[PDB]
RNA sequence: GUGAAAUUCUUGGACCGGCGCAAGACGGACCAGAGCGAAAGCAUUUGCCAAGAAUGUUUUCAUUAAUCAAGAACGAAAGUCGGAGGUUCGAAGACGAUCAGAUACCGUCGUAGUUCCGACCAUAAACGAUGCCGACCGGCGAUGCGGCGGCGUUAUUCCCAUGACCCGCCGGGCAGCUUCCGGGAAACCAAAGUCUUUGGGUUCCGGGGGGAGUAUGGUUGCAAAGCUGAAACUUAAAGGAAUUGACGG
């Protein structure tokens, strides 16, 4: 008869120290009765939140997952769980009379996380170009993709998860791919389209606390 | 009486083209034959763009766009008035119709 | 043009025409004197070389065969041979 | 009490409104930021009894108004929006209830965050229903 | 609405303008009086309908040419339009913008090396074609 | 009659005739 | 879910939202009057295996070539047999709709199949409804590949190449626009032209409409059927392209 929303109590959500904004928002969950522990109820919750809401003056077409791993008091401590491009940005990316190049790699972080990296790029038409189509030959696409794989993995396997996140928040990788690929075929709208988690390193509580601390 | 030189499809050097499904009736239509209308719609209609912008917490937000590419069989295209019958001479003009933007 | 002088075409369109479609066939290729760096002798390299020609005395390679014409390495001076 | 948190007056609280506005139905479903906890879910089917106007703008706006008073009742001021059509191999544009539910929610005292399309887009789906000759009508 | 003149009244009005131009003037009533004897019109309604369109036409032709024709109107308007008579011709330019290729053509003609001419900087970029395809 | 269905009807008649000849 | 419905699933938590897992399909958008292949056909990344056109060639053989009865390889889909797998879709079938009836079109399930391996079959509006090789006969702008030239912009570096464009040329392609080349019954076709001014070489193949791709014989196939293939009889038209009208849910 009585509603259970009285039995639901609210918590707050806290971001890792990669970002200048710390509070994502608020959740709700039932109280802990019997075997139903509210702590494990909050764990495993992902929060698709805009990067612009995480930073101060960055772009709003990126989104982070930020799954929770530890809860203490009214704080749900989250860690980076994946990044993706917004649907309207991806749809605007695809144009006719050009070539799309996609690459997917598996990179193991020095910290221990396993990451599947998705990166997309598009060919570019020059300012003085008169030809309607800017197409790249198959070997050019293959060399662009091979360069994309190699200089994506060479900077991500060389540093821990913390350094990976703080370097993809402006997508400095996409700028490096874009700069390196110009000698083969110029590209303009190069971004790391997506990145997802595959393995997690045994859930060290101290690593989360230092990631939210000093 | 061959009505069209291209037989109503853009296939010149191919033998076979994989089909698609009409987004209105799910007719199996060859891809090079179907009518492709790639629409860029506003997420919110022009009557409610004000109400969403007023209620937006952000001081300056840009309403997104729906990017849907639509594939039509010629029967659904004609029934939905996407394409119309034309004269014998008018059928040979391949320029897209004007947008009438001003 | 009905009265084109087929017998005496000017050299520019003959050079423009395909080699077999010329009035009399003439190969586009030619032989050229190539001086490899750090030597004294002169070796002949086909302008449309298909093999890597090697300066005998000097170690560096001369031409890398490509699609149409030989790819002379930097510093290799070449002179034509009687046009 | 008040079924909400201890948020300050100036600070706003963000929910997530999944609008599965397909043809023949208009789901309005406000959850929390994680999505695992729902606040209220009202649909045009539960607001009308004619069974043909379940995606109609009138039923969708009634659902939007009803979910709005529940969100305000439980203490929700701002609301992200995730519009969704049928998806899959079927149609990709949202039905007629998406627009009326959007306007009605805004005009019923609610704030709007970021709007995103979450229609399921297959890379390449299974065979669509209808046969190779389609729905002959 | 509904005041469009038939081809009957229009052509009759044009014809009497062709033959009788000096006899007619800007006044409607005078034009309808001369219409009585320069032409026979069995209807009074047609008479002043024709005369009405005559005054409308002659008002227009008092300051321009129309699809009607007068042999005088041809000759004095060709005597007029003498010229703007500029003090000098527009083609006697002191310096002429000449491409270097054009000067090469002129010296092939042998009429090159004229102090009136001066060569200009050739354009560089060779991008003259419009971008093919829609936009 | 549609030629395809006339063909199909013809196949039925041929199969009936083969049945009768096998019977004899 | 539909035009409206209904069958069907649903307080046993359906649908919806979230985190995951499994399965078998399918490779969107990029994707084009673009590429390749003898056609059928071929679209996620990377590697291996052979193969191929075109371009380049002052390399080699020296007529080794073109088309082809007999014969042979491949050959969409559906179908057959055997073994796996069966997500979706879906012949048959059932039910619910609709209708005067509705063995249907619409909806819910759903068998065979759709998927893979092997073995058959050899058929499509297998279409460009258009044989192959060769020669000649207009113009123009593109596009794919290769090659050759040239103002310039860009990539990095210290110069060239070398890539991205830009302006051309050559050859081989997919095509396009235009033309009183010419043809044709015209529609139209730079081939369907170079045809009473009739002969470049060579295959297949038609002879008014039906009967009829039927009967019979032979041969192939597990079958379904495929290949080859008449006659009696019947008929004054059947057809093609354009024109005008009339009509159109
Ligand atoms: Mg075919
Ligand atoms: Mg119909
Ligand atoms: Mg039901
Ligand atoms: Mg098959
Ligand atoms: Mg089987
Ligand atoms: Mg089913
Ligand atoms: Mg022959
Ligand atoms: Mg006959
Ligand atoms: Zn359709």
């Amino acid at each position: 008869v009585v509603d259970p929303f009285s039995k639901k109590d609210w918590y707050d959500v806290k971001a890792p120290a990669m970002f200048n904004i710390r509070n994502i928002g608020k959740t709700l969950v039932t109280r802990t009765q019997g075997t139903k522990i509210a702590s494990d109820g909050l764990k495993g919750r992902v929060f698709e939140v805009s990067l612009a809401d995480l930073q101060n003056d960055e772009v709003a077409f990126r989104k982070f997952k930020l799954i929770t791993e530890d809860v203490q008091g009214k704080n749900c401590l989250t860690n980076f769980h994946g990044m993706d491009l917004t649907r309207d940005k991806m749809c605007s990316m695809v144009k006719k009379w050009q070539t799309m190049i996609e690459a997917h790699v598996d990179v193991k972080t020095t910290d221990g996380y396993l990451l599947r990296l998705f990166c997309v790029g598009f060919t570019k038409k020059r300012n003085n170009q008169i030809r309607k189509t800017s197409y790249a030959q198959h070997q050019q696409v293959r060399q662009i993709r091979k360069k994309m794989m190699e200089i994506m993995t060479r900077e991500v396997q060389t540093n821990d998860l913390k350094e990976v996140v703080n370097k993809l928040i402006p997508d400095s990788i996409g700028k490096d791919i874009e700069k390196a690929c110009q000698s083969i075929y110029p590209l303009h709208d190069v971004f790391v389209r997506k990145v997802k988690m595959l393995k997690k390193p045994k859930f060290e509580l101290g690593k989360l606390m230092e990631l939210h601390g000093e | 009486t061959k009505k069209r030189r291209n037989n109503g499809r853009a296939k010149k050097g191919r033998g076979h083209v994989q089909p698609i499904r009409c987004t209105n009736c799910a007719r199996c239509v060859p891809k090079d034959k179907a009518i492709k209308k790639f629409v860029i719609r506003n997420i919110v209609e022009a009557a409610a763009v004000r109400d969403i912008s007023e209620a937006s917490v952000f001081d300056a937000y840009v309403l997104p766009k729906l990017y849907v590419k639509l594939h039509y069989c010629v029967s659904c295209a004609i029934h939905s008035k996407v394409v119309r019958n034309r004269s014998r001479e008018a059928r040979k003009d391949r320029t897209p119709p004007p947008r009438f933007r001003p | 043009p009905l009265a084109k002088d087929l017998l005496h075409p000017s050299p520019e369109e003959e050079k423009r025409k395909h080699k077999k479609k010329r009035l009399v066939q003439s190969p586009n290729s030619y032989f050229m004197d190539v001086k490899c760096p750090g030597c004294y002798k002169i070796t002949t390299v086909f302008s449309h070389a298909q093999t890597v020609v090697l300066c005998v005395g000097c170690s560096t390679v001369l031409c890398q065969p490509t699609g149409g014409k030989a790819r002379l390495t930097e510093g290799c001076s070449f002179r034509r041979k009687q046009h | 009490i008040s079924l909400g948190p201890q948020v300050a007056e100036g600070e706003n609280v963000f929910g997530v409104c999944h609008i599965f506005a397909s043809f023949n139905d208009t789901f309005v479903h406000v959850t929390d930021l994680s999505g695992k906890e729902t606040i209220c879910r009202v649909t045009g089917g539960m607001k009308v009894k004619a069974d043909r106007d379940e995606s109609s703008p009138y039923a969708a706006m009634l659902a939007a108004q009803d979910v709005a008073q529940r969100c305000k009742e439980l203490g929700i001021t701002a609301l992200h929006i995730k519009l969704r059509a049928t998806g899959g191999n079927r149609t990709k544009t949202p039905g007629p209830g998406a627009q009326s539910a959007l306007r009605a929610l805004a005009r019923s005292g609610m704030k709007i965050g970021r709007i995103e399309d979450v229609t399921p887009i297959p890379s390449d789906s299974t065979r669509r229903k209808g046969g190779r000759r389609g729905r002959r009508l | 609405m509904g005041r469009v003149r038939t081809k009957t009244v229009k052509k009759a009005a044009r014809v009497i303008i062709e033959k009788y131009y000096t006899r007619l003037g800007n006044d409607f009533h005078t034009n309808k009086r001369v219409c009585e004897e320069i032409a026979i019109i069995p209807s009074k309604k047609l008479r002043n309908k024709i005369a009405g369109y005559v005054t409308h036409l002659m008002k227009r032709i008092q300051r321009g040419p129309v699809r009607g024709i007068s042999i005088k109107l041809q000759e004095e308007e060709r005597e007029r339009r003498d010229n703007y008579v500029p003090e000098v011709s527009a083609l006697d330019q002191e310096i002429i913008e000449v491409d270097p290729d054009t000067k090469e053509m002129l010296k092939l003609l042998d009429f090159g090396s004229l102090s009136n001419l001066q060569v200009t900087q050739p354009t560089v970029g060779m991008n003259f074609k419009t971008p093919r395809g829609p936009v | 009659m549609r030629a395809k269905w006339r063909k199909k009807r013809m196949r039925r008649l041929k199969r009936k005739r083969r049945k009768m000849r096998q019977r004899s």
Side-chain angles (χ1 to χ4, degrees), chain D residues 24 51-52 90 123-124 126-127 129:
Chain D
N24 305 342
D51 179 83
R52 77 185 65 79
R90 293 191 293 171
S123 283
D124 279 314
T126 58
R127 175 152 190 123
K129 186 255 186 181

mmCIF file of all heavy atoms in Angstrom, chain D residues 24 51-52 90 123-124 126-127 129, chain G residues 1-2 4-5 27-28 88 107:
data_model
loop_
_atom_site.group_PDB
_atom_site.id
_atom_site.type_symbol
_atom_site.label_atom_id
_atom_site.label_comp_id
_atom_site.label_asym_id
_atom_site.label_seq_id
_atom_site.Cartn_x
_atom_site.Cartn_y
_atom_site.Cartn_z
ATOM 1 N N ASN D 24 2.438 3.605 -32.271
ATOM 2 C CA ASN D 24 1.397 2.953 -31.477
ATOM 3 C C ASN D 24 1.656 3.017 -29.977
ATOM 4 O O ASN D 24 0.857 2.456 -29.226
ATOM 5 C CB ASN D 24 1.172 1.481 -31.857
ATOM 6 C CG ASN D 24 0.865 1.300 -33.320
ATOM 7 O OD1 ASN D 24 0.494 2.248 -34.013
ATOM 8 N ND2 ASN D 24 1.021 0.078 -33.805
ATOM 9 N N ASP D 51 -7.125 2.831 -27.457
ATOM 10 C CA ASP D 51 -6.231 1.783 -27.953
ATOM 11 C C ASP D 51 -5.647 2.111 -29.327
ATOM 12 O O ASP D 51 -4.693 1.464 -29.772
ATOM 13 C CB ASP D 51 -6.962 0.430 -27.963
ATOM 14 C CG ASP D 51 -6.107 -0.701 -28.491
ATOM 15 O OD1 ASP D 51 -5.312 -1.268 -27.714
ATOM 16 O OD2 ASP D 51 -6.238 -1.024 -29.689
ATOM 17 N N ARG D 52 -6.155 3.150 -29.984
ATOM 18 C CA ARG D 52 -5.546 3.636 -31.213
ATOM 19 C C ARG D 52 -4.764 4.916 -31.013
ATOM 20 O O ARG D 52 -3.840 5.189 -31.779
ATOM 21 C CB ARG D 52 -6.610 3.868 -32.295
ATOM 22 C CG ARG D 52 -7.426 5.132 -32.124
ATOM 23 C CD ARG D 52 -8.528 5.213 -33.153
ATOM 24 N NE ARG D 52 -9.489 4.138 -32.966
ATOM 25 C CZ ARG D 52 -10.439 4.135 -32.043
ATOM 26 N NH1 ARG D 52 -10.589 5.145 -31.201
ATOM 27 N NH2 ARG D 52 -11.260 3.092 -31.960
ATOM 28 N N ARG D 90 13.759 -2.293 -37.616
ATOM 29 C CA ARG D 90 12.534 -1.572 -37.928
ATOM 30 C C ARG D 90 12.832 -0.078 -38.024
ATOM 31 O O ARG D 90 13.989 0.340 -38.133
ATOM 32 C CB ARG D 90 11.458 -1.904 -36.903
ATOM 33 C CG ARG D 90 11.014 -3.351 -36.985
ATOM 34 C CD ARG D 90 9.775 -3.609 -36.167
ATOM 35 N NE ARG D 90 10.016 -3.461 -34.740
ATOM 36 C CZ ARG D 90 9.059 -3.467 -33.825
ATOM 37 N NH1 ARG D 90 7.789 -3.616 -34.158
ATOM 38 N NH2 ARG D 90 9.384 -3.317 -32.545
ATOM 39 N N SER D 123 24.749 -2.425 -36.709
ATOM 40 C CA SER D 123 25.705 -2.457 -37.804
ATOM 41 C C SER D 123 25.087 -3.167 -38.995
ATOM 42 O O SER D 123 24.968 -2.593 -40.078
ATOM 43 C CB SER D 123 26.999 -3.136 -37.368
ATOM 44 O OG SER D 123 27.779 -2.263 -36.572
ATOM 45 N N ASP D 124 24.591 -4.383 -38.777
ATOM 46 C CA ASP D 124 23.819 -5.111 -39.781
ATOM 47 C C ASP D 124 22.955 -6.131 -39.062
ATOM 48 O O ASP D 124 23.468 -7.129 -38.548
ATOM 49 C CB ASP D 124 24.739 -5.760 -40.791
ATOM 50 C CG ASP D 124 25.186 -4.792 -41.839
ATOM 51 O OD1 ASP D 124 24.323 -4.054 -42.349
ATOM 52 O OD2 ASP D 124 26.398 -4.631 -42.024
ATOM 53 N N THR D 126 19.518 -8.725 -38.269
ATOM 54 C CA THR D 126 18.941 -9.903 -38.883
ATOM 55 C C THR D 126 17.930 -9.476 -39.945
ATOM 56 O O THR D 126 17.688 -8.288 -40.173
ATOM 57 C CB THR D 126 18.293 -10.779 -37.816
ATOM 58 O OG1 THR D 126 17.304 -10.017 -37.115
ATOM 59 C CG2 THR D 126 19.334 -11.252 -36.824
ATOM 60 N N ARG D 127 17.329 -10.461 -40.606
ATOM 61 C CA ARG D 127 16.351 -10.168 -41.643
ATOM 62 C C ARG D 127 15.128 -9.485 -41.047
ATOM 63 O O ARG D 127 14.621 -9.894 -40.001
ATOM 64 C CB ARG D 127 15.943 -11.453 -42.360
ATOM 65 C CG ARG D 127 14.840 -11.254 -43.376
ATOM 66 C CD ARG D 127 14.916 -12.267 -44.491
ATOM 67 N NE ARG D 127 13.995 -11.928 -45.567
ATOM 68 C CZ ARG D 127 14.357 -11.738 -46.826
ATOM 69 N NH1 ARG D 127 15.616 -11.863 -47.206
ATOM 70 N NH2 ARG D 127 13.434 -11.414 -47.724
ATOM 71 N N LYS D 129 11.187 -8.255 -40.770
ATOM 72 C CA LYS D 129 9.900 -8.910 -40.940
ATOM 73 C C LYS D 129 9.107 -8.247 -42.056
ATOM 74 O O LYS D 129 9.058 -7.019 -42.154
ATOM 75 C CB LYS D 129 9.108 -8.866 -39.635
ATOM 76 C CG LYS D 129 7.816 -9.646 -39.659
ATOM 77 C CD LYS D 129 6.614 -8.725 -39.760
ATOM 78 C CE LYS D 129 5.327 -9.514 -39.644
ATOM 79 N NZ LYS D 129 4.128 -8.646 -39.768
ATOM 80 P P G G 1 4.136 -3.229 -32.051
ATOM 81 O OP1 G G 1 5.532 -2.872 -32.396
ATOM 82 O OP2 G G 1 3.248 -2.217 -31.433
ATOM 83 O "O5'" G G 1 3.421 -3.758 -33.368
ATOM 84 C "C5'" G G 1 3.166 -5.141 -33.562
ATOM 85 C "C4'" G G 1 1.748 -5.369 -34.013
ATOM 86 O "O4'" G G 1 0.901 -5.612 -32.865
ATOM 87 C "C3'" G G 1 1.093 -4.196 -34.720
ATOM 88 O "O3'" G G 1 1.439 -4.142 -36.090
ATOM 89 C "C2'" G G 1 -0.390 -4.431 -34.472
ATOM 90 O "O2'" G G 1 -0.907 -5.380 -35.390
ATOM 91 C "C1'" G G 1 -0.378 -5.063 -33.082
ATOM 92 N N9 G G 1 -0.656 -4.102 -32.000
ATOM 93 C C8 G G 1 0.275 -3.479 -31.215
ATOM 94 N N7 G G 1 -0.241 -2.696 -30.315
ATOM 95 C C5 G G 1 -1.604 -2.811 -30.516
ATOM 96 C C6 G G 1 -2.674 -2.178 -29.844
ATOM 97 O O6 G G 1 -2.625 -1.388 -28.894
ATOM 98 N N1 G G 1 -3.899 -2.576 -30.358
ATOM 99 C C2 G G 1 -4.071 -3.452 -31.396
ATOM 100 N N2 G G 1 -5.339 -3.697 -31.749
ATOM 101 N N3 G G 1 -3.079 -4.042 -32.039
ATOM 102 C C4 G G 1 -1.880 -3.677 -31.549
ATOM 103 P P U G 2 1.469 -2.741 -36.869
ATOM 104 O OP1 U G 2 2.265 -2.933 -38.104
ATOM 105 O OP2 U G 2 1.843 -1.674 -35.914
ATOM 106 O "O5'" U G 2 -0.042 -2.528 -37.309
ATOM 107 C "C5'" U G 2 -0.696 -3.501 -38.104
ATOM 108 C "C4'" U G 2 -2.178 -3.259 -38.163
ATOM 109 O "O4'" U G 2 -2.766 -3.487 -36.859
ATOM 110 C "C3'" U G 2 -2.607 -1.848 -38.514
ATOM 111 O "O3'" U G 2 -2.548 -1.586 -39.904
ATOM 112 C "C2'" U G 2 -4.014 -1.783 -37.944
ATOM 113 O "O2'" U G 2 -4.924 -2.445 -38.807
ATOM 114 C "C1'" U G 2 -3.863 -2.619 -36.672
ATOM 115 N N1 U G 2 -3.618 -1.793 -35.467
ATOM 116 C C2 U G 2 -4.706 -1.246 -34.823
ATOM 117 O O2 U G 2 -5.847 -1.398 -35.209
ATOM 118 N N3 U G 2 -4.414 -0.499 -33.713
ATOM 119 C C4 U G 2 -3.167 -0.254 -33.180
ATOM 120 O O4 U G 2 -3.066 0.441 -32.170
ATOM 121 C C5 U G 2 -2.092 -0.858 -33.894
ATOM 122 C C6 U G 2 -2.352 -1.586 -34.982
ATOM 123 P P A G 4 -5.389 2.232 -36.497
ATOM 124 O OP1 A G 4 -5.054 3.352 -35.585
ATOM 125 O OP2 A G 4 -4.435 1.110 -36.645
ATOM 126 O "O5'" A G 4 -6.809 1.655 -36.067
ATOM 127 C "C5'" A G 4 -7.896 2.532 -35.818
ATOM 128 C "C4'" A G 4 -9.179 1.780 -35.579
ATOM 129 O "O4'" A G 4 -9.569 1.078 -36.784
ATOM 130 C "C3'" A G 4 -9.133 0.697 -34.515
ATOM 131 O "O3'" A G 4 -9.273 1.221 -33.206
ATOM 132 C "C2'" A G 4 -10.274 -0.221 -34.929
ATOM 133 O "O2'" A G 4 -11.523 0.320 -34.529
ATOM 134 C "C1'" A G 4 -10.182 -0.147 -36.452
ATOM 135 N N9 A G 4 -9.360 -1.234 -37.006
ATOM 136 C C8 A G 4 -8.027 -1.193 -37.308
ATOM 137 N N7 A G 4 -7.562 -2.313 -37.791
ATOM 138 C C5 A G 4 -8.665 -3.143 -37.813
ATOM 139 C C6 A G 4 -8.831 -4.469 -38.219
ATOM 140 N N6 A G 4 -7.839 -5.214 -38.704
ATOM 141 N N1 A G 4 -10.061 -5.007 -38.111
ATOM 142 C C2 A G 4 -11.053 -4.254 -37.624
ATOM 143 N N3 A G 4 -11.019 -2.993 -37.209
ATOM 144 C C4 A G 4 -9.781 -2.494 -37.331
ATOM 145 P P A G 5 -8.719 0.418 -31.930
ATOM 146 O OP1 A G 5 -9.784 0.423 -30.900
ATOM 147 O OP2 A G 5 -7.361 0.896 -31.595
ATOM 148 O "O5'" A G 5 -8.545 -1.070 -32.449
ATOM 149 C "C5'" A G 5 -8.699 -2.166 -31.567
ATOM 150 C "C4'" A G 5 -9.572 -3.223 -32.182
ATOM 151 O "O4'" A G 5 -9.324 -3.285 -33.610
ATOM 152 C "C3'" A G 5 -9.324 -4.639 -31.698
ATOM 153 O "O3'" A G 5 -9.989 -4.916 -30.480
ATOM 154 C "C2'" A G 5 -9.809 -5.478 -32.867
ATOM 155 O "O2'" A G 5 -11.227 -5.546 -32.877
ATOM 156 C "C1'" A G 5 -9.367 -4.622 -34.048
ATOM 157 N N9 A G 5 -8.018 -4.977 -34.521
ATOM 158 C C8 A G 5 -6.916 -4.169 -34.483
ATOM 159 N N7 A G 5 -5.837 -4.718 -34.973
ATOM 160 C C5 A G 5 -6.261 -5.973 -35.364
ATOM 161 C C6 A G 5 -5.582 -7.038 -35.958
ATOM 162 N N6 A G 5 -4.287 -6.995 -36.266
ATOM 163 N N1 A G 5 -6.282 -8.158 -36.222
ATOM 164 C C2 A G 5 -7.579 -8.187 -35.907
ATOM 165 N N3 A G 5 -8.332 -7.246 -35.346
ATOM 166 C C4 A G 5 -7.603 -6.150 -35.098
ATOM 167 P P G G 27 25.810 -9.688 -45.374
ATOM 168 O OP1 G G 27 25.509 -9.961 -46.799
ATOM 169 O OP2 G G 27 27.003 -10.305 -44.748
ATOM 170 O "O5'" G G 27 25.910 -8.112 -45.195
ATOM 171 C "C5'" G G 27 27.152 -7.439 -45.344
ATOM 172 C "C4'" G G 27 27.358 -6.435 -44.239
ATOM 173 O "O4'" G G 27 27.482 -7.131 -42.971
ATOM 174 C "C3'" G G 27 28.602 -5.559 -44.363
ATOM 175 O "O3'" G G 27 28.335 -4.280 -43.795
ATOM 176 C "C2'" G G 27 29.605 -6.287 -43.483
ATOM 177 O "O2'" G G 27 30.648 -5.478 -42.989
ATOM 178 C "C1'" G G 27 28.709 -6.789 -42.359
ATOM 179 N N9 G G 27 29.238 -7.963 -41.676
ATOM 180 C C8 G G 27 28.959 -9.281 -41.920
ATOM 181 N N7 G G 27 29.607 -10.088 -41.129
ATOM 182 C C5 G G 27 30.352 -9.245 -40.318
ATOM 183 C C6 G G 27 31.250 -9.539 -39.270
ATOM 184 O O6 G G 27 31.568 -10.650 -38.834
ATOM 185 N N1 G G 27 31.790 -8.383 -38.716
ATOM 186 C C2 G G 27 31.499 -7.110 -39.124
ATOM 187 N N2 G G 27 32.110 -6.113 -38.477
ATOM 188 N N3 G G 27 30.663 -6.823 -40.099
ATOM 189 C C4 G G 27 30.130 -7.933 -40.641
ATOM 190 P P G G 28 28.346 -2.962 -44.706
ATOM 191 O OP1 G G 28 28.023 -3.362 -46.096
ATOM 192 O OP2 G G 28 29.612 -2.242 -44.429
ATOM 193 O "O5'" G G 28 27.129 -2.099 -44.149
ATOM 194 C "C5'" G G 28 25.819 -2.277 -44.667
ATOM 195 C "C4'" G G 28 24.840 -1.308 -44.058
ATOM 196 O "O4'" G G 28 24.917 -1.390 -42.620
ATOM 197 C "C3'" G G 28 25.077 0.162 -44.360
ATOM 198 O "O3'" G G 28 24.500 0.545 -45.593
ATOM 199 C "C2'" G G 28 24.444 0.872 -43.175
ATOM 200 O "O2'" G G 28 23.048 1.026 -43.379
ATOM 201 C "C1'" G G 28 24.653 -0.135 -42.046
ATOM 202 N N9 G G 28 25.747 0.199 -41.118
ATOM 203 C C8 G G 28 26.913 -0.504 -40.936
ATOM 204 N N7 G G 28 27.680 0.001 -40.013
ATOM 205 C C5 G G 28 26.968 1.094 -39.546
ATOM 206 C C6 G G 28 27.295 2.039 -38.547
ATOM 207 O O6 G G 28 28.307 2.090 -37.843
ATOM 208 N N1 G G 28 26.295 2.986 -38.391
ATOM 209 C C2 G G 28 25.128 3.026 -39.110
ATOM 210 N N2 G G 28 24.285 4.026 -38.822
ATOM 211 N N3 G G 28 24.811 2.156 -40.049
ATOM 212 C C4 G G 28 25.771 1.225 -40.210
ATOM 213 N N1 U G 88 16.260 -17.453 -37.027
ATOM 214 C C2 U G 88 16.461 -17.788 -38.342
ATOM 215 N N3 U G 88 16.531 -16.803 -39.300
ATOM 216 C C4 U G 88 16.402 -15.481 -38.940
ATOM 217 C C5 U G 88 16.191 -15.149 -37.611
ATOM 218 C C6 U G 88 16.131 -16.162 -36.670
ATOM 219 O O2 U G 88 16.576 -18.969 -38.654
ATOM 220 O O4 U G 88 16.467 -14.610 -39.800
ATOM 221 C "C1'" U G 88 16.060 -13.722 -37.155
ATOM 222 C "C2'" U G 88 14.761 -13.043 -37.583
ATOM 223 O "O2'" U G 88 15.032 -11.672 -37.825
ATOM 224 C "C3'" U G 88 13.898 -13.205 -36.342
ATOM 225 C "C4'" U G 88 14.905 -13.109 -35.207
ATOM 226 O "O3'" U G 88 12.885 -12.223 -36.240
ATOM 227 O "O4'" U G 88 16.113 -13.699 -35.747
ATOM 228 C "C5'" U G 88 14.528 -13.819 -33.933
ATOM 229 O "O5'" U G 88 14.696 -15.223 -34.059
ATOM 230 P P U G 88 14.555 -16.185 -32.800
ATOM 231 O OP1 U G 88 13.667 -15.372 -31.946
ATOM 232 O OP2 U G 88 14.155 -17.535 -33.245
ATOM 233 P P G G 107 1.362 -7.443 -41.347
ATOM 234 O OP1 G G 107 2.466 -6.542 -40.947
ATOM 235 O OP2 G G 107 1.654 -8.636 -42.173
ATOM 236 O "O5'" G G 107 0.626 -7.927 -40.021
ATOM 237 C "C5'" G G 107 0.390 -7.029 -38.948
ATOM 238 C "C4'" G G 107 -0.276 -7.716 -37.783
ATOM 239 O "O4'" G G 107 -1.547 -8.267 -38.202
ATOM 240 C "C3'" G G 107 0.468 -8.903 -37.196
ATOM 241 O "O3'" G G 107 1.477 -8.512 -36.284
ATOM 242 C "C2'" G G 107 -0.643 -9.716 -36.550
ATOM 243 O "O2'" G G 107 -0.982 -9.180 -35.282
ATOM 244 C "C1'" G G 107 -1.809 -9.463 -37.504
ATOM 245 N N9 G G 107 -1.996 -10.548 -38.480
ATOM 246 C C8 G G 107 -1.793 -10.486 -39.832
ATOM 247 N N7 G G 107 -2.066 -11.601 -40.446
ATOM 248 C C5 G G 107 -2.475 -12.455 -39.435
ATOM 249 C C6 G G 107 -2.889 -13.809 -39.484
ATOM 250 O O6 G G 107 -2.991 -14.544 -40.470
ATOM 251 N N1 G G 107 -3.216 -14.290 -38.225
ATOM 252 C C2 G G 107 -3.143 -13.559 -37.070
ATOM 253 N N2 G G 107 -3.491 -14.183 -35.944
ATOM 254 N N3 G G 107 -2.756 -12.302 -37.009
ATOM 255 C C4 G G 107 -2.443 -11.815 -38.219
#
